Design a protein around this ligand. Structure first.
Ligand SMILES: N[C@@H](CC(=O)O)C(=O)O
Ligand SMILES: N[C@@H](CC(=O)O)C(=O)O
Ligand SMILES: N[C@@H](CC(=O)O)C(=O)O
Ligand SMILES: [Hg+2]
Ligand SMILES: [Hg+2]
Ligand SMILES: [Hg+2]
Ligand code: NA
Ligand code: NA
Ligand code: NA
Ligand code: NA
Ligand code: NA
Ligand code: NA
Lengths: 410, 410, 411
C-alpha cells in the first residue's frame, strides 16, 4: 500500500518524526521512545551497515577498472585528471566549510556511559604498511575497510590488464569475473533502494529520537550541518565551476541557462543516474560533440561527485565534533584522500553517499562498530535526504562542466 | 573397486555396522571402537559439515531467484502459493508427529562430560534485528547460518530484478554472477555425491558406535524416529494430498494408479531429480497440459519437498530430545518457518536434507559446533538413507499433486 | 615512474648494491639506522607477496586441479600427467636430499621476538589428517588455514570439471562461468605478482641491506650455501633424472640438449616458464615431435610440472627449518615431498611465482608465515630469489621437453 514520491515520502516521516519526538520529550518519558520506536531506526541503520562491506569493495573493483590506465584513451585522460582534481578540491572545501561551522560539537554524547575514546593511532611506518592486507579474504571477512579498499583498486587495475591480454582464455575469465563483481555492485545497490523504501519508517524513528533524547538543541545542530553543506555546495558552484568556465572560453552564467533542466531533475530525483537522459540531452544542447558527451557524461555519472566528496568532508567533521574528537591534520588530509575515493565509488543512486561515508569515517578513526561513533552516524543519517538533493545535483553539474572545458580543448 | 547399488551399498554397512558394534559392546571394549573405527564416521560427518555453508548460501541465492516476484508469471504464482502452503503444513505435521513420539529422549547423552547447556536466548528485539548481518562476508566466513540465509534471499531477489533492467551491461553482469553462484551450488552438490560415496564406510562407523556405546537402547530410539517419520509421511499423503485432490476434481485413489512408476523410482533413487524423466512421463499420462507440467514438475524438483520439511521437523525434535532440551513454542514455529526454507533449498540429490537439516538445527539453538549437538546429529545421520527414501518419494509426489490441482484451475 | 630496465638485471642491481650499503653500515654506522629507515621497504615488499598467497593458492588450485582431473584428460594425457607427477615428486625428494647434504641456514640462528621459534605441539595423527577437511570452507580462506583451503580447491576443481560432462546445458554454462571466474582471479592475481615484482628491486635492496646489516657477514655464505644446494641439485636433477630416462627409452640424451639450447637459455633469463613457450614449442617441432603431442604437453607442462620449483620448495623449507633452530622431522619430511609437489603444481610460471607458493609448503610443515621468526627466515631467502628463479624457471621448462619426448616414443 506504500508507494509515494519516494523523496517526499521521507520528508513526511522526518517533519513528523521531529514532532512525535519533541513532545514525548516532555509530557511522556522518552524511555517509551527508546524502548518502542527506536528499534525501527536501528533496523534501518543496520540494513545500510550491511551493504557497506560488499559495496565498498564491489564498487571499487568496478570503479577502479573504470579509470585504470591503460584502459582509457587520451580523450579520457584529459577528463579523469579533471574529475580527480575537481572532486579533491570539493572535499578540501567541505573540510573548510565545516571548519567554519562547528557542525555537531555541543551535541556532546557518550552512549556507552563513557565518552568516545580514540584507541592510540600508531607509528606512521606501521599505519601505511598495515594497509596491504596480509589475507584479503580475512580483510573483507571481518571489517577492515582500508585494506579491502587497497585490495579492490589493486584488483581492478589488474582486472583491466588482462583484457589487454594477447590470450583469449585469459581475457574471457578476466571479463566474466569483472562482470560478476559488478552485478554484485549492482545487486548491492538494488538492495540500497530496497532499504531506501523502508527509509520513511527508519528516518521517522531516527529523529523521533534525536528530538526525543537530545532535546531541542540538536535541531539547530542538524540545521547547522545542512547550512555548512549547502553554503559549501553553492560555494563550490560559484568559486569552483564559474571560476574555470571563465578560465577557458564558456560563458559561465549562460552555462546555467541551458543546464537548468538537468540540475532540477538531479535535485528532486536524488539520483545522479536518473538524471542522465536529462543530462546528455542538455549536453547536446550546448555545442558539445557526440563523442565527447558520450564518454564523459555517463562516466561522470558514477566517478566524479564533487557534491558527495564535500558531503563526506562535512559529515566526517560532524561525527568528530559529535563525539568530542579533535579531527587532526593528517587525518584532515586523509579525509581529503578518502572522501575522493569514497566519492569515486559512491553509487549515484538515492542514499549512496551516506553508506559510502562509512568508508571515510572508518578511515579517519571512527569505526561504525563503536557505539559512540555509530550514534553520531545514526543522527546525520536522519537528515540525509535533505542533503542528498543538493549533493546529487552538484554531482550532476560537475560532469557538465568538465565535459564543456575538455570540449574546448578538442 | 567400490561401485554397487549406492543405496544398497549403505544399507550393507548399516546392518553390518550395528552388528560389529553391538557385540564389541560386550566381549570387547568399545574404547577399541572409540579409538579405531570412530574416526571414520567423523571423516564422514565433517565432509558434510564442509558443504553446509556454501550450500546453504549458494542454494538460497539460486532458490530465491527461483520464486522471486516479479520473476514468475501468474501460472507460477498459483503453484508457489501451493508449494509454500503445502510444505509449511508438512513441517507442522512433522512437529506433531514427533510430538506424539518422543524420538530420542532417553537417549540422554552429555559428551563433554557435561550435559548440553542452552546459552541464554536473548530479548526478541535483538534476536530479530541480530539477523541483518552487519558484514555479509563476516557472516559466511565464520558460521552465522541465519544472517547468511537472510543475505541469500535478499541477494537472490535483487539478482532477478537486474535481469528486468532496461540496461544490457547491467543485465549481463547480474546474470554471469547468478550463473557463478549456481554452479557453486551445483559443484557443491557434486561434492555431496562425492561424500555420499564414502558414505558406506561413514555410516558403518556411525552406528558401529551408536550400537557400541549407547547400548541396545538406541536401536529402538532410532526406529522410533523412522516410525515418527514414515507414519507422518503417509499421514501426509492421506490427510493432506487425498484431502485436497478430493476438494477440487481429481479422483484421489486413481491419482496413485497413474503415478506408481514415479513414486517407486523416487523411493529407490533417493533423488527427487533422478525421478523427473519419470515424473514428467507420468504427468503427461494424466491429462496435464504441456505448458503446465513443463513449469511445475521440474520446479517442484528442487523447491517443494514436503517430505524433507517433515523430516527436518522430526530431526530437530530428535536432537532436542537427545540432548535434554525442551524445544520451546516459538522455537517450535521457528522450526516450521526454518524447515520450510531448509526444505526450499534442499538439493533433491541423495543426502541433501541431512546437510540442510543443520540450517534448521542451527536456527533453533543447537549449533553443530557444540560437541553435544553434533553428537545427536552424527547419530540420526546414520539412519539417513533409511529416511531418505520415504522422504525423496513424498517430495516427488507433492509436485504431481500441485500440478494436478492447478491443472484443474486452468 | 622512469623505472623500466631488464627486469631481472634490475633486481641483480639492487641486490649486489644492497649487500654493500648494508655490510658497511654494519660497521661505521648503527644498523638501527638501517633497521628504522631502510627496512620497512623490504617489508612493504614481503607483505605485498603475502597478500597474493591466499587467493593464489586457492584460485590456482581450483584451476590447476581442473587441469588434470580425470575424467577430464584423454589417455594421451594420462600418459603424461603420470610422468609429470612422478617426475616433480622425485625432484623434491632430491631437493630434500640436496639440503640434507648442505646445512643451508643453520648457524644463521635467529630469534626475532626476543624468543627463539617455538614449535606449537603437533597433535594426534587422527586429528591432523581429519583436521584438513575444513568445516566451513569460507572460514578456511577467510582466516589463514592454507591446508584446508587446498583440500577445498582440489575438491572443487575436480567437481567443477564433472559438471562440464553434464548432460544438462544450464548446469554446464554455470559450471563454466564459475570456473572461468575463478581463473582470472588466478590470472589477475599473478598480474599483481608482476606488479609487486616491479617494486621488487627496492624490496630486494632493503631485504639484503639488512641480512647484511644485521646478520653480519656470516649470512653471505649461508645465502650462497643454499644457492649451491639448489643449483647442484638442479643439475643433479638434469643429469641423474632426465638423461637417465632419455637413455631408458630411445632419445639420444646428449643430442637432446643440442636442439633444446634456445628454449633453456630463454627460460633462464626470462625467469618465466610461460615466456618460454613460443620458444619451447618451436624447439619441440625441431625434434620429430608430433603436432598433436607437442600441442597437449608443452603448454600443459607450462604450468603443471615444475621439477625446478619442486626442488626449490624442498631446499627452501629446509633453509627455514635450519634458520629457526627447528629439526625438520621425517613425516614432515615426506609432507614436504607431497606439499611441494602441489606447491609446484600450482606455481604460476611467471617471474616470482614459486617464492609465494613456497608459503603453502612452509605452512604445511609447521612454519606459518604469521610467526615473526618464520617470516624472518622467509624474508631472507626471499632476497636471493631471483638468483634461484633462473635455474628454477629453466629446469621447469626442460622437464616438459623431456616428458614430451618420452611419451612421443610411446606413440
Ligand atoms: N546523491 C548522490 C550520491 C550520494 O548519495 O552521495 C547522487 O546520486 O548523485
Ligand atoms: N532425499 C530428498 C532430498 C533430501 O535429502 O531431503 C530428495 O532428493 O528428493
Ligand atoms: N620461476 C618459475 C616459477 C617459480 O617461480 O617457481 C617459472 O616461471 O618457470
Ligand atoms: Hg542525534
Ligand atoms: Hg547414537
Ligand atoms: Hg637474513
Ligand atoms: Na556524477
Ligand atoms: Na561516485
Ligand atoms: Na520435489
Ligand atoms: Na528443496
Ligand atoms: Na613448466
Ligand atoms: Na606450477
Amino acid at each position: 500500500y506504500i508507494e509515494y514520491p519516494v523523496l517526499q515520502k521521507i520528508l513526511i516521516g522526518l517533519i513528523l518524526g521531529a514532532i512525535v519526538g519533541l513532545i514525548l520529550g516532555h509530557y511522556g518519558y522518552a524511555h517509551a521512545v527508546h524502548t518502542y520506536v527506536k528499534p525501527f531506526g536501528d533496523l534501518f541503520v543496520r540494513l545500510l551497515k550491511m551493504l557497506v562491506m560488499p559495496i565498498v569493495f564491489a564498487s571499487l573493483v568496478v570503479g577502479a577498472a573504470s579509470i585504470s590506465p591503460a584502459r582509457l584513451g587520451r580523450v579520457g585522460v584529459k577528463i579523469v585528471v579533471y574529475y580527480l582534481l575537481t572532486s579533491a578540491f570539493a572535499v578540501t572545501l567541505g573540510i573548510i566549510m565545516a571548519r567554519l561551522f562547528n557542525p555537531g560539537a555541543g551535541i556532546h554524547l557518550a552512549v556507552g556511559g563513557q565518552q568516545f575514546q580514540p584507541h592510540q593511532a600508531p607509528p606512521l611506518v606501521h599505519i601505511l604498511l598495515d594497509i596491504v592486507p596480509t589475507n584479503p579474504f580475512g580483510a573483507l571477512a571481518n571489517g577492515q575497510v582500508l585494506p579491502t579498499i587497497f585490495f579492490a583498486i589493486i584488483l581492478g587495475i589488474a582486472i583491466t590488464y588482462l583484457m589487454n591480454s594477447e590470450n583469449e582464455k585469459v581475457r574471457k575469465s578476466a571479463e566474466t569475473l569483472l562482470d560478476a563483481i559488478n552485478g554484485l555492485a549492482e545487486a548491492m545497490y538494488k538492495i540500497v533502494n530496497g532499504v531506501m523504501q523502508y527509509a520513511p519508517i527508519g528516518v521517522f524513528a531516527l529523529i523521533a529520537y534525536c528530538m526525543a533524547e537530545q532535546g531541542v538543541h540538536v535541531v539547530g545542530e542538524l540545521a547547522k550541518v545542512t547550512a555548512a553543506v549547502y553554503v559549501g555546495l553553492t560555494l563550490q558552484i560559484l568559486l569552483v565551476y564559474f571560476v574555470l568556465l571563465k578560465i577557458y572560453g564558456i560563458d559561465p552564467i549562460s552555462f546555467i541557462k541551458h543546464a537548468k533542466d538537468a540540475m532540477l531533475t538531479a535535485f528532486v530525483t536524488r539520483s545522479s543516474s536518473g538524471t542522465l537522459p536529462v543530462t546528455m540531452r542538455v549536453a547536446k544542447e550546448m555545442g558539445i560533440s557526440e563523442g565527447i558527451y558520450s564518454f564523459t557524461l555517463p562516466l561522470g555519472a558514477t566517478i566524479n561527485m564533487d557534491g558527495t566528496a564535500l558531503y563526506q568532508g562535512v559529515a566526517t567533521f560532524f561525527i568528530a565534533n559529535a563525539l568530542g574528537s579533535h579531527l587532526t591534520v593528517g587525518q584532515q588530509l586523509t579525509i581529503v584522500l578518502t572522501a575522493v575515493l569514497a566519492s569515486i565509488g559512491t553509487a549515484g543512486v538515492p542514499g549512496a553517499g551516506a553508506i559510502m561515508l562509512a568508508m571515510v569515517l572508518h578511515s579517519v578513526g571512527l569505526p561504525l562498530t563503536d557505539p559512540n561513533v555509530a550514534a553520531a552516524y545514526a543522527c546525520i543519517l536522519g537528515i540525509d535526504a535533505i542533503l542528498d538533493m543538493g549533493r546529487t545535483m552538484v554531482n550532476v553539474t560537475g560532469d557538465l562542466t568538465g565535459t564543456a572545458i575538455v570540449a574546448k580543448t578538442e
